[PDB]
């Protein structure tokens, strides 16, 4: 027992000695504090295992190869930390007895604990481990109990007490039987103070190797992970993840008294201590690149650099170019008092002669957007292009996946009368609706479209019509903001350029 | 109480003193495992045998109760020969008694050790057994623990510090666990009696035995045969397993750089492609090029630059096969497909899926399709997609994903299609007499240059080790001749799409040579050998 | 097996602070300023005025170190490295000694407030530093032997302290912590306040204390001690007189007191 | 740049260092790399070209003390790291080719003046190898002498040949009782095996 | 010229020519005592002057020569015997840094007498090949807590065999050299 | 390093090789086992000195030119016929010379004058080992 | 570190990131333009050869080296945290040549200190894999995979002496 004191005590050194983590306490807690007389941030800090490491390697090996021993101590000195700087006073009755101390996340330099979900071994149970890959499956979230608050009705004195279940604690502990109690040890009848008890939210998810790392043809394996507090939702299903955390096991292993010969295993879990994502989109400014873009704002020509510094491996095509980057850039939505509603994204469409860069140019787009989806127009069906029905669940289509972004779309020509007509809606009211057996619901879809087609006759022929050339409807080719077309015209000098362009590349 | 001692005691002079010529050979093998932290111990049954053949009396009789014995005896020996912790050690063993086939075994056979084969058919996840395991006390909060071991156990009742009817829970936080494994056995299919399908087993093994095997691997097994619980006083048996059995040097490359030394290498690998065929030299030429491929590319904005090549053939039926026997990675396919994917893949159902026909599944290597007529409507539009992007892409019954198809196409068959291929070439036949006469002789005595393998691996080493590129002359030269053409054209078409299959194909002329830079003596054939028409 | 094989003043006070506390036992070398001097001493008196003040007050040891701990950061580090921060504290105190040494009261005074000091930083201390400061001022143990016979007699004893003092509501843990206790035996008067308290076992005239206990004879010694070496220090302020621009310093320094 | 063709050529000689070292029996060192030299010869060739014209104009006085000092000291650098790569090439090949005229004392591999150079040093082996100190035999066995008598099996039909201690008829597969210090050189021709 | 495997070091054919130079104590079974010997690296006249069942001294591999033949009998070193075994054994365990002061030949010559003289003991052989593996076992060990102090400047050893010395001796030279390197690339 | 060459020793040693060889012929040509001695002594004794000319000989290729700077000081505190003996020096003035005519005209004839040298010290790098 | 040794030949072509101090004609050939200058500010990546003159002779020397990404502070507490797992073959094939002659040039204290604890703790599990003789592949192929070139060779001679003393004892 005398041990916890020591190591809450060296932990105080700790961070005493490394000031940069109060300046985080007391930070956090300002703008708590200030916004509440008027969103609130977490009670948790992020600690550099490497500070740890220089600091004392003693307590270093204890955090990295013992957490159950010295994950909690930790912890509790840095509730004594933020608790012993000033706060507001007069707290109200839930505040009083929240049972909420704050919480440990680490970053750096795990070493040999650095794995994956095909490689976690039976030697790692109970050390702290850092594991990789994509979530698969996410449960509901549910409240759990942890505290309950009791009055007494002669007395007038208000009692409570405490819960703990496996997934709670590092350390282990006498299980609780979730009953609330009825009456005093004296007799008195009792009453439950809702609002004045602590219930926290808890949340399993499912993490799976990386299919890049599959061996042949194999069965893929993964792990269950808990979370609760401030880490539920901040995934879903499909995310590149790295989680941290502790590697424990758990129940009776059929040793209670079972059919099964006690051949079956324990269960094994990863108790959720910090979670990072994988880039696999965006990124955040530093001030010089702040001041870099206004500077080059004020040059004289500023679209023709921009312009000509798109898809440079791509030789000509300027007016293309430059009508790709004002899509990139687009209009301003609006939304009228009476809530109607203004268009603000453009749509293109290029139409032409085989091999002249459609495709390639096209291309281009998919590698610079933000957020773009990309598909072949004879490989997609009108419901599967907008949304579907399953089970009722309605499921969504590409254009309503990339919602405030791009889709792409090559050989449009091959799509069918009867996939092309869903899309009349989406590129003008920006929602898809459904109207099915047990569904109706409206859904948002607010991107821009850009497509690539050939001609009727295969190449396009200046001496018929251009209805006879392009065969699409006139309410359809009316919601396209531009429309281009582009031929492969023979002559001496441009045929040299551009075999000359594409050799030097 | 005492034999226990005594065996221990026996086992442990056994590791100690058996000498066959001048070296103590299990003490130096338990000494040389430590170091690389392997604890285990592999004993073969014939020296025990030898030894003392009452030790082996003793282990044939009642084998799941003297193995623990034996396994602590080399924990005793490991401390002495490497300290002045350690967890017990695995016993694992070698024989060469009478294998049994896996039809006969019976009642006869429960707990007694069996040695047999078979195929492996699948095998599970890992799974934690509990070795060293800690107690709590729930009344008085005394504590406890207690040592498992895997042979044919529950928690006691025994309270101690009354003390309650069952008060005992475990403290997971200070204990001890190991790995586990299950596998199933199926009999030799050269031994099943006629007209019946095969039997099998299931199986168990841990720690060092684990994650050993994969499936449809033919192996012999050593182990225990016993029976567990899962009609009247009846259970299920199984094994538990105690032993299993189942780039270049630089020699190889002298002989490859030798080769790319001769004045005469690219008449030599034509030669050597499909011999038996008489003539349709520029057939053979284009496979060469086939084979070898160009080179891919990377840009600053990004874009990606194609390395493969594809062919087409309008006799034909053998040079598939043996593209498909030297090629170092190959599918071969009729038009139709394997299933309902057919070519590139298709949407099924009940909940719908995707699956991927043989352009998905041949990614990194070569797909032959032996009539490409025969393509069905949907893969008659998708190739398009999987020839020129080397991709496929599906939004379908709210299924969104895209496939890779990174491919090289030989494909033959008796319009536009012809269009995605970079060479197309017609097959030629001659009827000498002679030759027929030679094939059926050659029929007849199978029924009564460079060769494959060390071309494959050649083929190999020149794809890993180099990727040119064009120098300065064979750009002016290819551009002049484009223009050329084009004008040509004009006062009697030619397009950017082929002047870069032109280069592709250049490149893979000059990789045979090893050569870094392509030169104009490239670029010569490679334009001599465009004449597809 | 294998095998191989002024400065003084500065290693000076990184002896007198390897034990993190100090009796201040010896005498000051070399040089410091006069802003120093009078800046170090109110600091140290700044701490002792707060001390006085909450003892006036009835303020327990836990809300003492509540209100002093933030201090030492400001005024009077403590548990540092820094060779300027271990000068402060050791000449502050001496200084001090000029000031409170002119009479009864103020010896008194300053006794008092500077021993609760030493107890609050005794405390902050980790029990390897305790007995390694106790084990360097050279300060009887019973035997085995001794602690069979006297077994029932110590337990009872020690039996209530150990659950209210070390929080052993526990028997078995009692047990098992008086298994491993060691005990002191000396005569009576030296811990006759643990004796009107009886929470120590008295035989023959000799008491017996448990190791856990037993920091009021350490903090009744660095109070006697200090008490002498004031006594001491008063007999010879006549040399202290030869420097007029200390004298209106040290008045100041003890006006806050009078 | 200049030092590509010389990072290119060195390894080469790493790599016929490592299979020199994985075989002694199998020693026969790789084409002499022509053009790669011929190469990196020229290159310097032309680095002389270009000092040669920046002092024609340094003579002109076109902003000769800054101008020609820094342009001359960085091409006189390019120079000399290309003169320690040939020679780092040439002195591995010359080591491998001295290990064997110790045994020996077949030819297309050699470049001209390796070819002479091996012959040079054969002649200085056997002028050491005569005169004062022949009673040893310094091209002789490096193994100490562990017995008198050994039994030698007879593995190639080199007929009846004849040595300094007397003559022998190798008849196929007979087995010999007779003392190493004769049958050594044989040893190591290759017609006996120790047995 | 030399080679590679000969540039730093002795094969251990070199160290077994190297111990059979030393003295070997024999009983002849003839007597020479009135052809000559006439010897250039030894003594002669010991040869010479031998008469049958007369203790005499003589260098190892002319020792080993005789006995090959009926002409000899090789008395055993009295260090190779179970008693002094069993009391270095001891030796060994109780002070566990020091090596015991076993000579420095003793591998090479137990294995040289095993072959070559299995014969002339009087203890029974099969206990002593036992004993000689226990002694180099526990060596090992103490060999392997000793690299954790390998450094810039020395290191002591004591009763170390000649043989063991050069099992070690490329690798203890080696990593030393790269730690000089690095440390003295900092002063300069 | 290259340690000084015994040549008082060397010359006692070779005479008595060559007087031992001798008698070892005449008794044979005028019990076996005495000639069985001193033929395999004979033996012993010329292995050791053909390894140490070996192991000097690889020391001679190997610090060549160090050997020719230390000879070709005036300054120096000695001779290097003191250190070698005249075998020896023979080899070394002969092998630099076989050595210096292959690399002269394969590489060094076509460097400019500056970098003609093969003993330069003042280079980027120094071409001296030792 | 003598002259024609082919090693210290090989590792002396490694490049550096570098920055100019002056604007220089024609020399604009090292950014792969032989018709242009090089100007003041610029960086390049030169190899070591080159870059070790630049950086000295002058005053203002024309060059000045930037820190190299193998020497990061990631790679340093990677090093510190467990030397024996780390992949020094992947961070660079000639890290403890390159490491010496970077300490020589800029006579650096704790990255000397870093490097000697590295060194000291791999040799441990080198000799514990050069010790274990067969009378096993697999646990020994994982760690020689993390070699540098220059530990490899340290490895070969230290398994050809110990299997050599023991063929020559159970012979
Ligand atoms: N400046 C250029 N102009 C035209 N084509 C170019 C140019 N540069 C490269 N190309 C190549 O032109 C080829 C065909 O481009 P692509 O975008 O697929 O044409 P496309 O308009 O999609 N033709 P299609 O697929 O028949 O509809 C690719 O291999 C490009 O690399
Ligand atoms: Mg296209
Ligand atoms: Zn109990």
Not at chain 1, 411 to 430: C, G, L, S, Y
Not at chain 4, 68 to 81: G, H, I, N, P
Not at chain 5, 73 to 96: F, G, M, N
């Amino acid at each position: 027992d005398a041990v916890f004191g020591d190591r809450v005590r060296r932990f105080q050194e700790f961070l005493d000695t490394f000031t940069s983590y109060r300046d985080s306490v007391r930070s956090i807690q300002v703008y708590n504090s200030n916004n509440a007389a008027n969103n609130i941030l977490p009670h948790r800090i992020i600690i550099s295992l490497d500070d740890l490491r220089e600091f004392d390697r003693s307590f270093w090996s204890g955090i990295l190869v013992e957490p159950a021993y010295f994950i909690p101590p930790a912890e509790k000195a840095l509730t004594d930390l933020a608790d012993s700087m000033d706060d507001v006073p007069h707290p109200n009755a839930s505040a009083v007895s929240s049972r909420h101390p704050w919480k440990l996340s680490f970053k750096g330099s795990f070493g040999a604990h650095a794995l994956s979900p095909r490689t976690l071994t039976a030697q790692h149970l109970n050390k702290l481990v850092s594991v990789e890959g994509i979530v698969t499956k996410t449960s509901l979230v549910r409240p759990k109990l942890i505290r309950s608050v009791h009055y007494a009705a002669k007395t007038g004195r208000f009692h409570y007490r405490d819960y703990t279940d496996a997934t709670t604690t590092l350390t282990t502990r006498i299980p609780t039987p979730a009953i609330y109690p009825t009456e005093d040890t004296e007799g008195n009848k009792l009453t439950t103070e809702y609002g004045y008890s602590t219930f926290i939210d808890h949340q399993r998810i499912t993490v799976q190797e990386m299919p890049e790392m599959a061996p042949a043809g194999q069965l893929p394996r993964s792990i269950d992970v808990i979370l609760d507090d401030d880490l539920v939702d901040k995934t879903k299903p499909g995310d590149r993840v790295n989680v941290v955390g502790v590697f424990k096991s758990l129940g009776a292993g059929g040793m209670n008294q079972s059919n099964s010969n006690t051949l079956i295993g324990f269960k094994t879990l990863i108790l959720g201590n910090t979670v990072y994502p994988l880039h696999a989109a965006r990124q955040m400014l530093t001030d010089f690149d702040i001041r870099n873009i206004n500077k080059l704002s004020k040059k004289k020509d500023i679209f023709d650099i921009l312009s000509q510094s798109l898809a440079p491996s791509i030789y000509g095509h300027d007016h293309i170019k430059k009508a790709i980057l004002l899509m990139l850039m687009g209009g301003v939505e609006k939304n009228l008092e009476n809530g109607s509603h203004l268009r603000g994204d453009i749509n293109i469409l290029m139409v032409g002669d085989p091999s002249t860069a459609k495709s390639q140019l096209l291309r281009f787009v998919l590698n610079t957007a933000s957020l773009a989806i990309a598909t072949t127009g004879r490989g997609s069906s009108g419901v599967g292009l907008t949304a579907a029905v399953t089970t009722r669940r309605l499921e969504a289509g590409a254009m309503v996946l990339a919602d405030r972004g791009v889709v792409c779309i090559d050989e449009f020509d091959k799509m069918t009368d009867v996939d092309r007509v869903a899309i009349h809606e989406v590129m003008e009211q920006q929602t898809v609706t459904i109207a099915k057996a047990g569904i109706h619901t409206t859904l948002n879809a607010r991107c821009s479209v850009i497509a690539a087609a050939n001609p009727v006759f295969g190449q396009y022929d200046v001496n018929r019509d251009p209805h006879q050339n392009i065969a699409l409807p006139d309410s359809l080719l009316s919601r396209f903001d531009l429309l281009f077309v582009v031929t492969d015209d023979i002559n001496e000098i441009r045929d040299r350029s551009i075999s000359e362009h594409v050799l030097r590349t | 109480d005492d034999d226990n001692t005594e065996i221990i005691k026996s086992f442990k002079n056994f590791i100690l003193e058996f000498r066959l010529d001048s070296q103590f050979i299990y003490r130096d093998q338990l000494r040389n495992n430590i170091l690389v932290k392997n604890y285990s111990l592999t004993v073969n049954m014939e020296h025990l045998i030898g030894y003392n053949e009452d030790i082996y009396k003793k282990l044939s009789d009642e084998p799941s109760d003297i193995i623990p014995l034996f396994e602590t005896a080399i924990t005793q020996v490991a401390k002495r020969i490497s300290i002045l912790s350690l967890p017990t050690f695995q016993l694992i063993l070698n024989s060469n008694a009478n294998q049994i086939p896996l039809r006969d075994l019976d009642s006869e056979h429960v707990s007694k050790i069996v040695r047999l084969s078979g195929i492996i058919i699948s095998t599970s996840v890992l799974s934690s057994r509990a070795t060293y395991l800690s107690i709590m006390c729930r009344n008085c909060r005394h504590t406890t623990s207690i040592t498992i071991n895997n042979f044919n156990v529950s928690l006691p009742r025994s309270c101690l510090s009354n003390c309650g009817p069952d008060p005992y829970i475990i403290i997971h936080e200070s204990s001890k666990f190991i790995d586990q494994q299950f596998l199933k056995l199926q009999e030799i299919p050269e031994l099943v009696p006629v007209g019946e399908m095969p039997r099998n087993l299931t199986m168990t093994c841990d720690r060092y035995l684990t994650n050993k095997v994969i499936p449809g691997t033919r192996v012999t097994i050593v182990g225990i045969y016993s029976i567990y619980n899962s009609g009247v006083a009846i259970r299920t048996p199984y094994i538990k397993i105690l032993g299993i059995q189942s780039m270049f040097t630089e020699e190889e490359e002298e002989e490859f750089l030798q080769l790319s030394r001769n004045p005469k290498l690219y008449e030599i690998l034509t030669n050597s492609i499909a011999p038996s065929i008489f003539g349709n030299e520029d057939i053979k030429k284009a496979i060469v090029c086939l084979l070898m491929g160009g080179s891919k590319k990377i840009l600053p904005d990004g874009m990606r630059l194609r390395g493969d090549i594809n062919v087409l053939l309008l006799a034909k039926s053998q040079l598939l096969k043996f593209v498909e026997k030297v090629s170092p990675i190959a599918v071969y396919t009729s038009g139709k497909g394997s299933s309902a994917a057919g070519l590139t893949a298709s949407v099924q159902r009940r909940e719908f899926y995707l699956e991927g026909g043989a352009m998905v599944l041949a990614d990194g290597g070569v797909v032959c399709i032996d009539e490409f007529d025969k393509m069905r409507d949907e893969d008659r539009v998708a190739i398009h997609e999987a020839m020129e992007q080397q991709t496929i892409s599906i939004a379908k019954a709210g299924i969104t994903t895209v496939l890779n198809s990174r491919t090289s196409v030989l494909a033959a068959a008796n319009t536009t299609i012809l269009s995605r291929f970079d060479m197309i070439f017609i097959v030629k036949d001659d009827h000498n007499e002679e030759r027929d006469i030679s094939i059926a002789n050659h029929v007849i005595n199978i029924h009564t240059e460079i060769s494959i393998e060390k071309m494959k691996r050649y083929i190999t080493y020149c794809r890993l080790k180099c990727a040119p590129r064009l120098s300065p002359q064979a750009a002016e030269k290819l551009s002049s001749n484009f223009v050329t053409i084009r004008k040509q054209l004009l006062i009697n078409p030619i397009t950017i799409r082929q002047l870069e299959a032109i280069i592709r194909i250049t490149e893979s002329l000059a990789k045979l040579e090893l050569s870094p830079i392509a030169q104009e003596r490239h670029v010569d054939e490679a334009i001599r050998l465009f004449q597809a028409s | 097996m294998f095998r191989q094989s002024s400065e003084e003043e500065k290693k000076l006070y990184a002896r007198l602070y390897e034990s993190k506390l100090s009796f201040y036992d010896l005498p000051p070398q070399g040089e410091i300023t006069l802003e120093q001097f009078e800046i170090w001493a109110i600091d140290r008196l700044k701490i002792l005025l707060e001390i006085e003040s909450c003892l006036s007050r009835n303020k327990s040891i836990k809300e003492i170190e509540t209100i002093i701990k933030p201090q030492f950061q400001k005024l009077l580090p403590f548990n540092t490295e820094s060779l300027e921060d271990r000068k402060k504290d050791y000449y502050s105190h001496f200084i001090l000694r000029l000031c409170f040494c002119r009479s009864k009261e103020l010896r008194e005074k300053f006794v008092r407030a500077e021993t609760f000091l030493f107890k609050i930083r005794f405390n902050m201390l980790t029990s390897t530093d305790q007995t390694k400061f106790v084990q360097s001022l050279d300060l009887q143990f019973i035997s085995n032997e001794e602690k069979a016979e006297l077994s029932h007699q110590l337990y009872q004893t020690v039996s209530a302290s150990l659950q209210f003092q070390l929080n052993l509501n526990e028997e078995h843990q009692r047990k098992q912590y008086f298994q491993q206790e060691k005990f002191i035996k000396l005569p009576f008067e030296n811990v006759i306040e643990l004796v009107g308290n009886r929470l120590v076992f008295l035989k023959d005239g000799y008491a017996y204390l448990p190791q856990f206990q037993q920091l009021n004879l350490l903090s009744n010694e660095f109070a006697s001690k200090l008490n002498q070496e004031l006594i001491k220090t008063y007999q010879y302020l006549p040399r202290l007189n030869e420097d007029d621009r200390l004298l209106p310093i040290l008045n100041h320094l003890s006006s806050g007191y009078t | 740049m200049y030092g590509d063709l010389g990072n290119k050529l060195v390894l080469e000689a790493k790599r016929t260092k490592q299979l020199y070292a994985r075989s002694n029996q199998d020693v026969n060192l790789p084409m002499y790399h022509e053009d790669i030299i011929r190469n990196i010869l020229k290159e310097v060739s032309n680095l002389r070209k270009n000092t040669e014209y920046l002092k024609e104009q340094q003579q002109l006085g076109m902003l000769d003390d800054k101008v020609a000092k820094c342009q001359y000291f960085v091409t006189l650098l390019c120079m000399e790291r290309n003169k320690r790569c040939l020679l780092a090439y040439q002195r591995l090949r010359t080591d491998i080719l001295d290990s064997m005229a110790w045994n020996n004392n077949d030819t297309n591999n050699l470049s001209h003046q390796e070819q002479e150079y091996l012959k040079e040093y054969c002649d200085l082996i056997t002028d050491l190898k005569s005169g004062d100190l022949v009673d040893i035999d310094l091209s002789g066995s490096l193994v100490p002498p562990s017995d008198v008598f050994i039994d030698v099996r007879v593995l190639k039909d080199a007929g009846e040949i004849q040595t300094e201690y007397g003559v022998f008829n190798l008849i196929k597969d007979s087995q010999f009782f007779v003392r190493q210090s004769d049958v050594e050189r044989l040893i190591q021709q290759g017609y006996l095996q120790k047995i | 010229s030399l080679p590679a495997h000969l540039q730093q070091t002795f094969s251990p054919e070199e160290i077994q020519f190297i111990v059979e130079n030393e003295p070997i104590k024999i009983f002849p079974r003839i007597t020479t005592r009135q052809t000559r010997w006439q010897l250039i690296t030894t003594d002669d006249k010991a040869l010479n002057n031998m008469v049958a069942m007369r203790s005499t001294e003589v260098v190892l591999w002319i020792a080993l020569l005789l006995k090959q033949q009926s002409k000899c009998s090789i008395v055993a070193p009295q260090w190779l015997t179970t008693k002094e075994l069993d009391r270095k054994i001891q030796y060994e365990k109780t002070h566990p840094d020091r090596f015991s002061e076993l000579p420095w030949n003793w591998l090479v010559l137990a294995r040289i007498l095993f072959n070559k003289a299995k014969d002339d003991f009087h203890d029974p052989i099969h206990e002593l090949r036992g004993k000689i593996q226990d002694l180099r076992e526990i060596r090992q060990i103490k060999v392997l807590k000793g690299l954790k102090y390998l450094n810039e400047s020395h290191l002591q050893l004591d009763n170390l065999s000649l043989l063991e010395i050069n099992e070690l001796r490329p690798f203890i030279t080696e990593i030393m050299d790269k730690l000089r390197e690095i440390h003295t690339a900092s002063l300069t | 390093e290259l340690l000084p060459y015994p040549h008082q020793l060397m010359k006692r040693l070779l005479n008595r090789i060559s007087m031992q060889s001798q008698l070892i012929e005449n008794i044979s040509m005028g019990s076996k086992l005495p000639l069985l001695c001193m033929e395999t002594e004979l033996e012993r004794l010329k292995f050791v000195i053909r390894s140490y000319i070996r192991c000097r000989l690889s020391k001679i290729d190997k610090f060549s030119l160090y050997l020719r700077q230390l000879n070709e000081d005036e300054n120096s505190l000695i001779s290097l016929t003191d250190l070698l003996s005249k075998d020896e020096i023979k080899y070394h003035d002969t092998h630099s010379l076989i050595w210096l005519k292959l690399v002269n005209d394969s590489i060094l004839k076509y460097m400019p004058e500056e970098l003609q040298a093969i003993n330069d010290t003042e280079g980027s790098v120094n071409m001296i080992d030792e | 570190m003598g002259y024609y040794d082919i090693d210290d030949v090989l590792a002396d072509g490694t490049e550096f990131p570098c920055k100019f101090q002056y604007d220089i004609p024609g020399l604009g050939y090292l950014e792969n333009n032989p018709g242009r200058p090089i100007t003041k500010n610029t960086k390049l990546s030169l190899p070591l050869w080159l870059a070790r003159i630049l950086a000295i002779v002058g005053p203002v020397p024309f060059v000045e080296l930037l820190p190299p990404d193998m020497f990061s502070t990631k790679v340093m507490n990677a090093i510190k945290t467990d030397p024996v797992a780390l992949d020094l073959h992947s961070i660079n094939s000639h890290f403890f040549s390159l490491a010496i002659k970077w300490i020589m040039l800029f006579s650096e204290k704790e990255l000397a200190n870093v490097v000697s604890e590295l060194l000291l703790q791999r040799a441990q599990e080198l000799n514990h894999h050069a010790s274990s003789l067969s009378i096993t592949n697999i646990a020994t192929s994982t760690f020689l995979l993390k070699l540098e070139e220059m530990e490899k060779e340290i490895y070969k001679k230290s398994h050809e002496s110990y299997k050599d003393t023991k063929r020559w004892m159970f012979k």
